[PDB]
């Protein structure tokens, strides 16, 4: 519906890169929210606010004046603390409920085989939570799988390899009402 | 590292000097919700369906860059102008979907270890440049505060064509070239 953003605090009074990022960590939806901001100067985080600490802390010596100044101003420290509710809790319970937490893309399964063996390709799905299984008649652990591949366009793909030479690749995904089974030919 | 079910990066401000280069993005579970075009002052959603459901005032992101541009000038005058060295990026080309000859597909070039976030990524079809039908994402942040970026190329998988992903960066004495053909594995 409407997204809320984290506002970084300001400093008082040859190529360089400055980074700021505000992170919201969710566990049981909104029952456990952790809120962290990071101030980076040339690949060196120097000031970080962490909701587990409750105040700004100097990561390196360069950030001691900035952390002390921001924590000494009550109106500044209280604005940063309240961002766990005005940003993290608001975005999860609000716009993300209509967008990210609702996006579901059904996976595509192909069962082509080749060895130097019998790999199952599960492509284009969302979210990344997925379970792939091998079962000719009963599932065999044996077998290695690739890491979760992030396509970058809100889709994922994964490749599971069956080390062993009527087979079925079993896939369970939150987007599927029933698990997908494909009749492998070898 | 922090363990959680979801990570919402509601605000990523990156600014570079000289050149007056900025970028503001929103992330959820590692994927880009949108970026604020700092020149047009408009919000650009990666998924067009998300823009139809949610919204975001881009002026908030613009004033987010105004803060980091201010803090960077103060930090430059504090660290006695200490710049960060350039890094050599690494590229990886792989297809989005299982390759089927004649069926349209998308080629992905994953360039990682990008710092500073300034790069020149281009595609080549049979040693000839192709500029039409190419999409490029923003700079995603890494945990070591370096960056990575993905480029896309829609193509028709033929048995003859040879594709290259050319990467030009300040940390490269020679451009990096990653190859891909229709009969490869990765």
């Amino acid at each position, epitope marked *: 519906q*409407v997204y809320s953003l984290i506002r970084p605090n300001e400093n*008082p009074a040859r190529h360089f890169v400055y980074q700021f990022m505000g992170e919201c960590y969710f566990t049981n939806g909104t029952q456990r929210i952790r809120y962290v901001t990071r101030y980076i100067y040339n690949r060196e985080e120097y000031v970080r606010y962490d909701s587990d600490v409750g105040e700004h802390r100097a990561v390196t010596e360069l950030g001691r004046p900035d952390a002390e100044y921001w924590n000494s101003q009550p109106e500044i420290l209280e604005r940063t603390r309240a961002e766990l*509710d*005005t940003v993290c809790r*608001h975005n999860y319970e609000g716009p993300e409920t209509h967008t990210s937490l609702r996006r579901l893309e059904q996976p595509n399964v192909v069962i082509s085989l080749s060895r130097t063996t019998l790999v199952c390709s599960v492509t284009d799905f969302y979210p990344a939570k997925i379970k792939v299984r091998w079962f000719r008649n009963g599932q065999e652990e044996t077998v290695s799988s690739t890491q979760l591949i992030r396509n970058g366009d809100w889709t994922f793909q994964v490749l599971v390899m069956l080390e062993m030479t009527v087979y079925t690749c079993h896939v369970e995904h939150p987007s599927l009402k029933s698990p997908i089974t494909v009749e492998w030919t070898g | 590292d922090i363990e959680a079910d979801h990570v919402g990066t509601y605000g990523i401000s990156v600014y570079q000097s000289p050149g007056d280069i900025g970028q503001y993005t929103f992330e959820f579970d590692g994927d880009e919700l949108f970026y604020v075009d700092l020149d047009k002052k408009e919000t650009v959603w990666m998924l067009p369906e998300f823009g139809q459901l949610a919204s975001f005032d881009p002026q908030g992101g613009l004033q987010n860059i105004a803060v980091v541009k201010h803090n960077l000038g103060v930090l430059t005058k504090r660290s006695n102008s200490t710049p960060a060295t350039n890094e050599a990026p690494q590229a990886t080309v792989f297809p989005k979907s299982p390759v089927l000859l004649g069926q349209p597909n998308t080629l992905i070039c994953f360039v990682d270890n990008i710092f500073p976030p300034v790069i020149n990524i281009t595609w080549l079809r049979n040693s000839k440049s192709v500029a039409d039908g190419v999409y490029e994402t923003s700079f995603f942040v890494n945990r070591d505060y370096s960056f990575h970026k993905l480029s896309y190329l829609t193509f028709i998988p033929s048995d003859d064509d040879i594709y290259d992903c050319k990467v030009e960066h300040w940390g490269l004495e020679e451009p990096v070239l990653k190859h891909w053909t229709s009969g490869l594995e990765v």
Partner: T-cell receptor, first 112, second 115 residues
Framework: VTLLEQNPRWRLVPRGQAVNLRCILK??????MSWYQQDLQKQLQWLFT????????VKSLPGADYLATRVTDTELRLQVANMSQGRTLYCTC????????FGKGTRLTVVE | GDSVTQTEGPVTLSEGTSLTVNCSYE??????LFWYVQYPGEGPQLLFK?????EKGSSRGFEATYNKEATSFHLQKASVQESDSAVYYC??????????????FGKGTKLSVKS
């Protein structure tokens, strides 16, 4: 005391003429400078908010065309052209934690 | 945060009575509520602010409650005075949305206190 300084206080503006206004910031802890408009019916409305030097924003509402500029760290300008209805323009300053402080204001009177 | 509805003035009270200026806000993001007073020959100046919801801010004899339940910010004073004859504005600002230093004002309520 006064954290801002806005000049002039009054202005007689012929119809269709342009007006240039100034505002000087006197406190560094209030860097977010803004322009607010109060019409003849005493209705306050936010116009711009400029922070970094070189910012340039345009707003065109009925009665006056605006053009605000943040020249330096403490200089805030505003040009009001094609004016056909009188109004008052207040220069304001505030920190990021919203605490807006209004100046004395500049009353613009349009005469035909 | 679109609108802020305020009590339609003018309010005429006798010195010693109690003031009650209603205000109801309508927003989509967490706001910070304000009360501004403008005297007949001055500019609008901040009376008090309430950043935290379900709390109350006080200035002179004026009080207002950040009632998040009913989305209200009613201004109340026990004993009004002639010197308080001015126009009062209900205002808010989004804590995590849009531009900074951006207040949304109501239409304003005029107060006239006769001795």
């Amino acid at each position: 005391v006064t954290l801002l300084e806005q000049n002039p206080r009054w202005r007689l503006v012929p119809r269709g003429q342009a007006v240039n206004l100034r505002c000087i910031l006197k406190n560094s802890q209030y860097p977010w400078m803004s322009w607010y408009q109060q019409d003849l019916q005493k209705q306050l409305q936010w116009l711009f908010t400029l922070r970094s030097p070189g910012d340039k924003e345009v707003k065109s509402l009925p009665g006056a065309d605006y053009l605000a500029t943040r020249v330096t760290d403490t200089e805030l300008r505003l040009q009001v052209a094609n004016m056909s209805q009188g109004r008052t323009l207040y220069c304001t300053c505030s920190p990021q934690t919203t605490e807006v402080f209004f100046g004395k204001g500049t009353r613009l009177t349009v005469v035909e | 945060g679109d609108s802020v509805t305020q009590t339609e003035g003018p309010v005429t009270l006798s010195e010693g009575t109690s003031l009650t200026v209603n205000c109801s806000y309508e927003t989509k993001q967490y706001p910070t509520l304000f009360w501004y007073v403008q005297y007949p020959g001055e500019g609008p100046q901040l009376l008090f602010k309430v950043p935290k919801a379900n709390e109350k801010g006080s200035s002179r004899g004026f009080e207002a409650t950040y009632n998040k339940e009913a989305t209200s910010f009613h201004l109340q004073k026990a004993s009004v005075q002639e010197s308080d004859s001015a126009v009062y504005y209900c205002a808010l600002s989004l804590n995590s949305g849009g531009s900074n230093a951006k207040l949304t004002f109501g239409k304003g309520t005029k107060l006239s206190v006769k001795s």
